[PDB]
Structure formats: C-alpha cells, structure tokens
C-alpha cells in the first residue's frame with residue numbers, strides 16, 4: 001500500500017490514508033502552489049505515487 | 060531635501076540588492092518540500108519507512124547545501140540582519156548536527172527548525188525595510204511604512220512565501236516608479252492579502268509625495 005503524504009500548502013483531506021496498488025487520488029494545492037507540470041491526479045504504483053504529490057511554488 | 064534623497068537612495072540600494080529574495084526562498088522551498096512532507100508524514104502518522112525519512116534529512120543536510128542557501132540570504136541583508144535570523148540559522152544547524160545517518164529520531168526537530176527559519180527569512184526582509192523606512196524624515200511616509208510593516212507581518216503568519224512574493228513585488232514596483240498592482244493576485248484565498256495591498260497603496264501615495 002501507498003501512504004498518502006502530508007502536503008505542505010495543499011489540501012490535506014487524504015493525509016495518513018493508505019491505498020492499494022492502482023488507486024488514483026485527486027491532489028489539490030493552495031493558490032500560488034501546484035503539482036509540477038500542472039498534474040492533478042496521482043496513482044499508487046510499484047515504487048510509490050506516480051507522479052510524486054508535492055505542492056511546489058508556481059509563477 | 061538632502062536627507063530625503065539619501066533615504067530614498069538607501070531604500071533603492073536595499074531593494075536592488077534583495078530583489079532575488081523571493082525567487083531564492085522559493086528555490087529552497089521547492090527543493091525541500093517533498094522532504095518536509097515525508098518527515099511530517101512519518102512524525103504525524105503510522106508511516107514507518109525510515110529509509111525515506113533518512114533520505115529526507117539528507118536533503119536538508121547534505122554538503123551544507125541548504126544551510127548555505129540560507130546563509131546566502133542572510134548575507135544579502137547583512138547591513139540590517141536581525142539577531143533572530145542568525146539564532147534560527149544556528150538552531151537549524153544544531154538540529155542537523157544531531158541527526159546521524161540511519162537515525163531519524165531528530166527528524167521532526169529538523170523539519171520544525173527549517174520551517175521556523177524559512178518564515179524568519181521573510182520577517183528579516185520586512186525588518187530590513189522597517190529599519191530603512193524608520194530613518195525617513197517625512198512623517199507621512201514613516202507612518203505609512205509602519206502600517207505596511209505590520210500588515211506584511213500578519214500576511215507572513217498566514218503564508219510566508221506568498222507574503223514574501225507580494226512584498227518583494229510591491230516594494231520593487233514602488234521604487235522603480237511602476238504603479239502598484241492593488242488587486243489580489245491569489246484568489247483572495249489568503250485573507251491577509253487585501254489589507255496588505257491597501258497599506259501598500261497608502262505607502263505608494265506617501266512615497267510619491269516625497270519623490271515629487
């Protein structure tokens with residue numbers, strides 16, 4: 001199972017939940033932040049979440 | 060007269076020297092946010108993969124890279140540096156020293172120390188502007204600067220990096236004779252943005268009355 005991480009500057013409704021392989025999750029960041037490359041969903045895969053959820057500063 | 064020009068000169072020099080402050084603090088934030096998240100996940104919940112937490116401490120510690128990025132920001136405001144900034148850099152460094160490889164017992168302390176230091180970087184920019192604007196003779200500008208400082212600090216407590224971006228942009232526009240953008244650029248999601256920008260408009264009016 002993949003543990004959904006705490007998200008600095010994100011919406012944290014899924015923090016600490018764990019999910020089976022293949023599960024998708026919506027990720028939302030606060031204004032001024034975003035997942036890289038505008039992505040909004042992550043999927044639990046063999047090596048963890050793909051892509052990696054994290055709320056980076058965006059211009 | 061002569062002193063007002065020298066005050067304006069001192070401000071413009073500070074603003075130019077510190078113009079990368081938001082870009083550089085955002086750069087630290089982006090490199091570290093995944094690591095910060097992994098530590099918080101481990102410390103707040105049942106997630107137990109210590110190898111991830113060790114890799115996260117490594118981001119904050121390795122080659123003193125992140126410490127040196129903070130020291131670089133300290134050097135930019137050297138002439139005005141607050142004692143609380145030097146103290147919080149040292150506390151970060153001490154918590155990093157306590158972390159030995161494969162020991163994650165100090166992980167939350169490292170994350171907490173980093174977060175306090177990151178906010179204090181923004182506060183140190185504000186404090187530097189406070190020091191400079193306090194030396195102005197014009198009472199209207201002095202008063203408007205003090206209100207700008209206090210609204211800025213309340214913004215920082217809500218979100219440090221967004222506040223810094225707004226502060227750096229607003230003061231940069233003002234001293235480069237660009238009209239201040241007085242509308243919320245972050246959806247009014249940050250409740251303190253509106254009162255900051257109102258104080259920025261009043262500071263702009265006071266600055267232009269001097270500049271004339």
Ligand SMILES: [Mg+2]
Nearest residue numbers: 154157165168
């Ligand atoms: Mg400790």
